Amino acid sequence: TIKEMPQPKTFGELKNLPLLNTDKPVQALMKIADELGEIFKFEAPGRVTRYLSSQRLIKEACDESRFDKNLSQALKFVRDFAGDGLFTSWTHEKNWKKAHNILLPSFSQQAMKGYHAMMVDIAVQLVQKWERLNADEHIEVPEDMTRLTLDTIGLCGFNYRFNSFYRDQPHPFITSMVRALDEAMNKLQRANPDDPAYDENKRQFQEDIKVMNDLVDKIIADRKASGEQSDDLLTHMLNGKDPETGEPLDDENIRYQIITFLIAGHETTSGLLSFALYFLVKNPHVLQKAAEEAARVLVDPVPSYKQVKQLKYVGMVLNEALRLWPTAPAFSLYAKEDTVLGGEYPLEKGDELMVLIPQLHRDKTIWGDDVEEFRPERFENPSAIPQHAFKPFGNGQRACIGQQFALHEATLVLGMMLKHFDFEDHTNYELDIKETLTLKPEGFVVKAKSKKIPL
Numbered sequence: 001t002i003k004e005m006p007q008p009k010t011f012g013e014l015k016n017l018p019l020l021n022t023d024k025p026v027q028a029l030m031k032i033a034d035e036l037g038e039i040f041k042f043e044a045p046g047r048v049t050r051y052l053s054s055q056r057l058i059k060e061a062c063d064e065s066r067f068d069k070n071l072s073q074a075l076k077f078v079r080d081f082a083g084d085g086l087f088t089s090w091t092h093e094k095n096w097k098k099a100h101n102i103l104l105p106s107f108s109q110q111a112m113k114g115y116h117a118m119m120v121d122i123a124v125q126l127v128q129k130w131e132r133l134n135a136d137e138h139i140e141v142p143e144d145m146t147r148l149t150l151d152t153i154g155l156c157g158f159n160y161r162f163n164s165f166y167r168d169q170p171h172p173f174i175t176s177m178v179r180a181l182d183e184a185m186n187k188l189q190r191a192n193p194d195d196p197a198y199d200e201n202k203r204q205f206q207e208d209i210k211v212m213n214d215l216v217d218k219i220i221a222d223r224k225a226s227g228e229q230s231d232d233l234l235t236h237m238l239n240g241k242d243p244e245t246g247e248p249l250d251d252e253n254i255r256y257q258i259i260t261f262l263i264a265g266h267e268t269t270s271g272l273l274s275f276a277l278y279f280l281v282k283n284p285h286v287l288q289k290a291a292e293e294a295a296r297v298l299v300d301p302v303p304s305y306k307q308v309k310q311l312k313y314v315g316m317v318l319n320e321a322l323r324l325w326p327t328a329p330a331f332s333l334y335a336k337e338d339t340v341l342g343g344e345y346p347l348e349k350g351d352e353l354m355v356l357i358p359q360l361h362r363d364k365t366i367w368g369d370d371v372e373e374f375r376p377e378r379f380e381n382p383s384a385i386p387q388h389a390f391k392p393f394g395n396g397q398r399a400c401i402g403q404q405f406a407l408h409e410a411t412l413v414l415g416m417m418l419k420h421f422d423f424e425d426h427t428n429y430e431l432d433i434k435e436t437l438t439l440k441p442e443g444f445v446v447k448a449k450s451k452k453i454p455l
């Protein structure tokens with residue numbers, strides 16, 4: 001029969017909204033899910049959504065005949081600089097399907113062969129940085145992983161070198177992108193946004209949008225003028241035509257796609273590598289097994305594309321890190337028509353859902369009682385995992401287009417890290433997860449003892 005869904009504590013006219021007035025709102029929602037279970041209602045002035053945490057309900061939310069991607073308020077605020085790029089467009093906007101059709105072949109597993117050399121260029125910069133540290137210097141892990149993933153998508157995205165390993169202070173483009181993402185997420189908990197106290201925030205936001213547009217528009221214009229052909233996504237987007245409409249992307253949409261890819265490289269992938277190394281140093285037997293694989297497979301100075309594919313256990317380590325701390329921690333859906341969720345929760349057309357991915361990934365009915373343990377071997381027999389239990393890359397046609405790119409880079413880089421260094425958790429680091437667009441382990445530091453294996 002139909003059930004009334006639970007709701008967390010209220011704040012009078014503000015309803016549930018003050019629960020998210022915290023620097024760690026996703027972690028707050030995870031604790032609410034632990035208390036209330038697989039579904040809860042969340043109300044704010046002028047809005048309602050429902051947070052889902054169980055595979056039982058999320059499998060139904062993943063039914064594209066019943067639910068489509070919604071732009072969360074977070075993505076609506078990011079859309080002020082990511083425009084109608086793939087991540088911040090509605091499925092029904094012409095530019096979504098057009099860009100999807102044009103870009104999907106450039107993001108396939110086969111396409112990764114063409115990006116591999118560029119990925120290796122930045123991975124070798126990381127390895128050399130760490131080889132060149134003096135005794136008992138340490139590594140700032142999320143900082144170096146962010147230098148790597150941003151530079152990798154800049155080089156693969158539009159043949160542009162941010163040169164992050166040559167800097168303390170990021171490239172001006174990156175400082176603007178980070179400040180724009182901070183303003184976007186900050187606005188989720190800004191009570192009176194038209195207060196004159198925020199005139200400076202708005203001025204800075206418009207300045208940061210201009211910095212991002214000016215660099216990307218200039219590179220697109222420079223490439224069109226030269227006629228140069230490279231192994232980058234920009235070459236693919238200038239050349240490509242959508243088979244359906246017969247149209248190419250216009251220069252403005254190409255700029256939004258580049259900004260969108262750069263947001264993605266900077267946040268998700270660096271978080272995944274940071275969490276993977278955190279779990280490895282906290283689980284030395286797992287670290288040893290992964291290091292043994294890296295030594296057995298990566299027999300050449302430079303990893304080959306085919307060797308990265310052979311790092312099976314490293315791939316399982318990365319999936320297990322995505323299980324516990326999926327770095328893009330939620331996505332939003334709306335009901336296409338009236339429908340009943342799970343035989344119990346009637347929804348009206350337009351009703352919204354949020355998928356709380358870290359909670360989904362803690363469903364004991366799927367994973368068993370050891371759900372907080374870091375055990376990559378739980379990915380050894382993936383045909384045994386029920387549908388829609390593991391969703392770190394989202395769902396269906398609106399799933400991450402970058403999944404093969406992210407996993408190729410992370411497997412390459414983690415493999416090289418484990419080949420070249422022993423790691424020490426020299427501070428006995430206490431996990432502290434900072435929330436931006438994404439999740440990452442703030443203040444995570446290690447020491448790395450070279451195995452003295454030349455590149």
Ligand code: HEM
Binds near residue numbers: 069260327331397402
């Ligand atoms: C260079 C790396 C990456 C790029 C270029 C990339 C790019 C994108 C793009 C363009 C989309 C939108 C696809 C569409 O709707 O047509 C997307 C969606 C998504 N990506 Fe990625 N991505 C990357 C890495 C990651 C990583 C590492 C994760 C998670 C660990 C991730 C999680 C997601 C999720 C959850 C969505 C769906 C969002 C939603 O439903 O609102 N991405 N990505």
Ligand SMILES: CCCCCCCN1CCC[C@H]1C(=O)N[C@@H](Cc1ccccc1)C(=O)O
Binds near residue numbers: 020189328332437
């Ligand atoms: C890559 C991940 C992007 C989206 C992550 C969402 C990250 N939000 C950060 C706060 C919690 C989480 C979320 O549930 N927000 C929803 C609902 C909402 C709307 C307005 C104000 C507060 C919350 C939303 O943005 O609509």
